[PDB]
Amino acid sequence: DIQMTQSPSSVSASVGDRVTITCRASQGISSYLAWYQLKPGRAPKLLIYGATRLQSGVPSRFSGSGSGTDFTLTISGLQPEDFATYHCQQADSFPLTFGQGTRLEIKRTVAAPSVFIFPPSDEQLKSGTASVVCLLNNFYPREAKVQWKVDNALQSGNSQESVTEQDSKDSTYSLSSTLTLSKADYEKHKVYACEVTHQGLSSPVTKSFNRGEC
Amino acid sequence: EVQLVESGGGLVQPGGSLRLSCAASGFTFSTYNMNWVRQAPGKGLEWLSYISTSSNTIYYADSVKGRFTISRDNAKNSLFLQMNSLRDEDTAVYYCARDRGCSSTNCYVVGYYFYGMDVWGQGTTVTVSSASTKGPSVFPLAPSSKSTSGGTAALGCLVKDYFPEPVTVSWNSGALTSGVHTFPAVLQSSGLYSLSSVVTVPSSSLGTQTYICNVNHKPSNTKVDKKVE
Amino acid sequence: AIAGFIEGGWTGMVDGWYGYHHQNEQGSGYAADLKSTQNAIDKITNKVNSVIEKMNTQFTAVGKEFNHLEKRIENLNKKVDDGFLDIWTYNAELLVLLENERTLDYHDSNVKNLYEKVRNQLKNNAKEIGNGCFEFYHKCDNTCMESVKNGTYDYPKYSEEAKLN
Amino acid sequence: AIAGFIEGGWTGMVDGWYGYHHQNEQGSGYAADLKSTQNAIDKITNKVNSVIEKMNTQFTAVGKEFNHLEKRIENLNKKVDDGFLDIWTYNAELLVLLENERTLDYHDSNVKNLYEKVRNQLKNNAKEIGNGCFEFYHKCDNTCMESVKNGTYDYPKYSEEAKLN
Amino acid sequence: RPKVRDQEGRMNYYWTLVEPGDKITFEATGNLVVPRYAFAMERNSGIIISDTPVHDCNTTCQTPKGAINTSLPFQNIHPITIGKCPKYVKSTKLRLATGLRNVP
Amino acid sequence: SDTLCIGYHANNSTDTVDTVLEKNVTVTHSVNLLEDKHNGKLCKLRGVAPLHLGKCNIAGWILGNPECESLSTASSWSYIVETSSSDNGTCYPGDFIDYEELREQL
Amino acid sequence: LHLGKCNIAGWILGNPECESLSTASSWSYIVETSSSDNGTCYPGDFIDYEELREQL
């Protein structure tokens, strides 16, 4: 198929600044290009059609132009209600290949995360599989990593993270990592720590607990 | 008004079939074109098929390879999609869309798909997996006071090994709203989802105040309440 | 060119305005063009919007009431109401008469532009028997029939077999 | 025929609208026609004067002021001021839309009238490869290039050498 | 009357034309504002509200937002026009094409 | 060997026109039939110098308002120019009957 | 705003046969009927009446 390419993957800008999101086609079209505004839980809305005009109901803050394969979506009137994922669509020929998607985020000051860690209870260890949950709140940006270390040894292949969306008021994120361990391997180890690596922290915060004091 | 209503959700085992439906009202159905655009979790939009008013020129995507069958009816104003040979990669949210037709502001003569699509619908959740329906496993987390410089604490519950997605996790049947944050579901390697939910509480009433973690699984009708202490 | 050199339109092709009817050893059927029809639709769709978007009417009234003690201004109001009506009886009925004269000429221009798209590529490789038909002097499969629609028909490449028959 | 059978115009010939590009053994360069360009300029220059000389306006005013005790006649004055404006929003914007449609058609007619001036004199003495090009099958000097521009190209006088190549 | 410009009274001003050979007649016993000067006039234009300065230039049409020398069929600046003036439209571009389509 | 190609005019013009075939079409040469420019001056009409009143309106000049004393009325004019701040007209209030007819007669 | 059987002069003056009427806070046009005879119950010469029908 005729593939599409967007750049970059995520744009972080504030209200009032200029947002430049490009979408280059692999072949020459020069007349037909679509642009959608996809929201989670809502229907997408066509913003730009043909890369020259604007759809009815769309405000005049959006703008698009280009001839050939180079096209530019210029936003000089950015509102707080427009921080969403945008997609480009080729209209000719078939198939109607959509874009990759570019998430627009609110730019603010870098904040330090608050590290929390929950020890496993007695109801989860008796079931045969226990898990330790580490919590990260009030951090920016979304690029945060959780380094699980058990008895001063880095673990891999048995952890999974879960990140929420951006906050409407604080413009922050929330992260929760879960390290899955078996019943026989839980009683062998004693120290369970959650080392946090963040851009806003000058030193890695490592919170741990005791296995016999859960 | 001009709107599209999607229906036909549920749980389909791999190797079966599923027929989707899209209702249309408030506009002429026998003059415009229709499409099928899905959205995988973690991916973007994906065009599937195209049909005309006379159902003569029918297109298919590269990911379909003739496995799907799209039909319509101009008299009943309906759009159907007979899907066959469903696998685990077909788990997406299927929508319905109408082509624009022209380049002017008001298209009085409907053309083709050369100027994108404008009308969009709500969509339905379609999940195809070989795993059966399994109730969630609720385990409470032990509270602890780790925020020394902030003087706060945290507590919550861990929900794992359930099918299908999602699970709406609340606290005190919706009464507790301060500090409640719901994490999205992440699919594990075993074929089941997992999510968490925490409540930010101060460290003054950590070892005295308790909360009830309410777990509500909507497709399986499973409601498990576990006290966190 | 309806009821002229060409007889008329067909009811088999309902997927557009213009197109071609394939007839060879591989099959047959009706097929409309996606390039020439979509461009010609935008010419007529902007023509309808040329008298709607440019007619910048305001939130006012055209009709008005008057008393019969003011028959001096009621006659001028008759020149306002029926005077604009007599212009709109003249100008608007001329627009529908002249733009449909343009549309029947532009559809005739869409005939001739599609004819010159075929005739300049099939000077000696097709027989002109009228009614928009072009019988090839060689083998022309479904890939060859789609090349004349998009305009990708090379003349010296297909003239090697048409000169023998 | 811009963005059609012909690609577009050139920036080398700035001495007129239409013309020819000479390319032979004696030299090369751009040259515009003195007969076809000057006649076609007078078509467009009289078109601009068609809406200026015929618009016989008088020494009067279009706008007028009124009092708010005369709102019965102020509504008719709104039908005089904005009513003639809505005609001028309709009629004047249609003229620029239709005469430029006539100008683009007459320039396309200036292409076809210059094409039939060449094609009727070069039926077998030139190869039609598109984009307004006509490659001769024999020697054509600068005197021969000026004969096709003025229309003084005899067909049997130059067909003796073109039939050999 | 209501107090306008610290004056509780009004004064209605009237006017008429006098034909050549006609004799005007005034007769009143009070509340008459008699004229001091007269304006002898002879004609075959309207009013303009603007803040543009005056110069010794010459043109064929006048507009409040500036001088206009047309020699053009249409204009789009102001409807209140005085003299041999072009038509007023609400459009922003009415450019008549004379040359070919600018495609390189 | 020779090449005779029909040439057409093209330049770097940015003025676009409106056609029924396509909107926003760039042309090479064009005459702007819509006057969008303005000199910003009050010129004459057919050699006749107009009458400018300044801060006073017509009713301040036809009645003799005392704040419009610095004024040299010419023997002929073609139009009367008022200002947006023309408040020094009728210094005494009143109902100017048939006032709109007198603004066109003079 | 729909006045029913009464015309504008029955509404702007307060005719008693047009009591069952709920006047909205905003409108765009006034609708009269062909049998609008229950307007001015007392006769008179409504001076400048045609300009008042366009102002409201």
Author numbering:
A (entry chain K): 1 to 214
B (entry chain I): 1 to 229
C (entry chain G), D (entry chain B): 5 to 169
E (entry chain A): 227 to 270, 273 to 332
F (entry chain A): 10 to 115
G (entry chain E): 60 to 115
Pull verbatim passages from the article behind this deposition.
The envelope glycoprotein HA of IAV is the major target of neutralizing antibodies. The globular head domain mediates the receptor binding process, and the HA stem leads to virus-cell membrane fusion induced by the low pH in endosomes. The representative antibody 28-12 exhibited broad neutralizing activity against both group 1 and group 2 IAV viruses in vitro and protected mice against H3N2 and H1N1 virus challenge in vivo. Our two cryo-EM structures showed that the 28-12 Fab specifically recognizes the conserved HA stem region for both H3 and H1.
To provide the structural basis of the unique recognition pattern, we determined the cryo-EM structures of the 28-12 Fab in complex with the trimeric HAs from HK/68 H3 and WA/11 H1 at 3.7-Å- and 3.5-Å-resolutions, respectively, with imposed C3 symmetry. Moreover, W21HA2 on the fusion peptide forms hydrophobic interactions with V109HCDR3. Another two amino acids from HA1, including V40HA1 (which is a hydrophilic amino acid N40 in H3) and L300HA1 also form hydrophobic interactions with V109 and Y108 both from HCDR3. It appears that 28-12 forms more contacts with H1 (48 contacts) than that with H3 (17 contacts). The mutations D19AHA2, W21AHA2, and V40AHA1 in H1 significantly decreased H1 HA reactivity to 28-12, while the mutations D19AHA2 and W21AHA2 in H3 did not affect H3 HA binding activity to 28-12. The epitope dependency on the distant HA1 residues and the fusion peptide in the primary sequence probably makes the epitope in H1 HA more conformational by 28-12. We hypothesis that cleavage of H1 HA0 may cause conformational change and destroy the integrity of epitope in H1 HA, thus resulting in reduced binding activity to antibody 28-12.
